[model samples]
Target chain A: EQHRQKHFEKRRKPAAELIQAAWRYYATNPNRIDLVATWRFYESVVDLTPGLKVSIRAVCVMRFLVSKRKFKE
Target chain B: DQLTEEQIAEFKEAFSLFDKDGDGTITTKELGTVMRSLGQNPTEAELQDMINEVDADGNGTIDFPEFLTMMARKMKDTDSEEEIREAFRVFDKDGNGYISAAELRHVMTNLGEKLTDEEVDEMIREADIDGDGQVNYEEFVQMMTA
Candidate 1:
């Protein structure tokens, strides 16, 4: 049970980190940036581990923020 | 390490879906709706935090390059984590691993971030994962980490 909690936290940390990174990226960048641009951007900037892809749906969510216009910018 | 042209094309298709004005930038206020669409259900404060953390050039708004840079950065333990835990620990004075509304009120006063009863209750509602009407260590962690 103790080990389970540790594993859970380890997994949670990376997922949480990714989520925060996604959020921060959405916050700082242009609203009109498309998934393709995001994919290109991620490609140019991040060294993804094998088999890791920033899904179109994930990028879609980030763009969705701009559609909602939650902030003044 | 870069995106394939095929993937980039797909992203352009998706980007076109939301760039209604064709202005090459998105307005910021509409993000809350996007959060709703994504089922993330972010709080106003959380949304604000996102912008504050990512606005690297300090221009108060996001552009495409800034957006890409923010997304590409790896996550690490930020300096504020320890201080946040310490503050919450101070409020959870009884050491029960959770904070009551009253306790939050007292601590908020001490920190000069005073909240009315309603505000304290709202804070608890935001972070009380167990529905126990208090903020536990896990809930507190989630709140601060976000």
Candidate 2:
């Protein structure tokens, strides 16, 4: 239906599934950050790491790598 | 730009659902779970892309106001799926289908920070369903999307 597709992607909706996804995003834990890293990157963050001891685990590398990716793109 | 009371209630419920830790801020990891629950089955990369795009503050996580306006879109073009299995593959370097606290500690050691061996065990304990406290594929899956 060629209704008002809010920016094409801005519409084409499903408030329910999106709502569920939002909840889970809010649901990730700080302590067990592996859940956050692996789910998002599929182990690539680890793959890139030099295997050194740091402070937070994938939180730092994943954040660093992902941020670099978004910014570069 | 008017919103109904019902919409506000939905927002609160959704926020509460994702803010499982009640920390009041939704971290990137938290949002990954949300996609999995919906069965959109996004990988961590796409999940990060999903949140990063909506992360108005560049804070690496989302807030209440941010989330309210955020869910308007999904990871529409994001490469998706394999859910927990992929997570299992990521963490279980042993490929033995099970990894113990020692193995987990090593992975954590390399990827970012170093955690106490006991603390690592605590991480394993949450999802390690069997009494042995080792992470099995099924247990690891539950840890992710579960």
Candidate 3:
């Protein structure tokens, strides 16, 4: 309250940061239209043996079975 | 068919884990959870044969000694192709040697995780080489091991 009337002021905001933020948004949506994005997405995945993948999930059911009174041994 | 002392110790631990009632014996139903978890769908006749062969004393239950005997006979060096073929057989329910889209979707949804129709279709596309809309054993194995 003791200070003089506040002046409208401009602060240092680097133009490069704004440019970087806007371009990142643009490039992210580019994948939506490009098939190359599909390849790149699959490319980043860890490739491993698929040997009966769904079958391994049966253990979760067995876990559930063991927990419940109905299927409890 | 010779199990090391270490393997026998491991088996004893497994036996007690499955025994469930501290009865020193495993019942058919207890053993069945393991089989079912491994995708084995044994019929009553098959189960009868399994018990007759492994029960050893006509007791209709598997004790530790009989369990060890059965495990000894059951343990085999798993050949890759043979085991993979066994897995594929479960999905190739029609015995056509190809896993169709419907079969893939049906099995996955019924199993845990409950994948979506579209989700499984993506999996099919990734493996259904030749654009056939289904997977042959070669393609199926490749997808599995990839």
Candidate 4:
């Protein structure tokens, strides 16, 4: 039983992975708060076609809170 | 897969049927004539739906290549290549290993409710070749048309 438990535990998600998954969930939400998250991620997405149109400050704040915890895009 | 000569013949026939009056580009009215020939009796609305699905250019008309691509797409609609191959194989009547207008028409008729003349016309515009207003065996072969 201990061997089986170790094998399963090896496949379990890490703490950061949980946050990343949560971030994805929040980013895709259609609610107003989700929209803010979406705006942030959209800006963070370095290659958005029309980057000039996005509010850089809003995106900056979104990422500093959510994405900086990860790697720089 | 390479198209058999016989299959090419069928497509040509369908193409010619659409190129009514011998004009290159098909008009909605000419399309109507071709549809009736295929055992269809589509209303204007139904016809428009068929047109929209294949007329990606929004030209309100279909050329030969455009028509063939749409037909090919229809035959290839499933997720698996095997399914597409099976469907394509079934359409290849006469064992010549290719499909023709007659084969295409018969299969369409048997698949569900027949389309309206407008819908049929839309299909013709999508398939007809040689700009003479009809599909010849050459065009059909071109489809599997190697």
Report, to 2 decimal places, the DockQ of model 2. Answer: 0.04
lDDT of 2 by residue, A1-73 (tens): 5443343333112221232232233223333455443233323232332221121222232333343343223
- Model 2 ranges with Cα > 4 A deviation: A1-73, B1-51, B55-66, B69-84, B91-94, B113-119
Each candidate structure's TM-score, on Cα atoms with residue i matched to residue i, is: 0.33, 0.36, 0.34, 0.33
By TM-score rank, best first, the candidates go 2, 3, 1, 4
Residue A42 lDDT (model 2) = 27
lDDT of 1 by residue, A1-73 (tens): 4755564443432332332333333332333243233344344534542222333343433433332232112
Residue ranges of candidate 3 with Cα displaced over 4 Å? A1-73, B20-23, B28-57, B72-96, B107-133, B138-146
- Tens digits of per-residue lDDT, candidate 1, B21-112, equal 66644334444444454334566665555555545677654455555553443222232344344445544546788877555556543333
TM-score computed on alpha carbons, candidate 1: 0.33
> Distance (Å) between predicted and true CA of A72, model 3?
29
lDDT of candidate 3 over A1-73, digit per residue (tens): 5232121111101111221111122222222333132223222432331222211222222222222211111
Off by over 4 Å in 4: A1-73, B2-6, B78-146
CAPRI category for model 3: incorrect
Q: Residue by residue across B1-146, what tens digits does model 2's lDDT show? A: 34468655656666766677888887767866644543335577766775675578988887878766543322222222243244335455446788675665565444432333444454566556666857675644443443
**DockQ of all models, two decimals each:** 0.04, 0.04, 0.02, 0.01
Candidate 4, residues A1-73, lDDT tens digits: the string is 4864573343222222222222233233323241343344333433442222222321222222232223211
Residue range with the least summed lDDT across 10 consecutive positions in model 4 chain B: B74-83
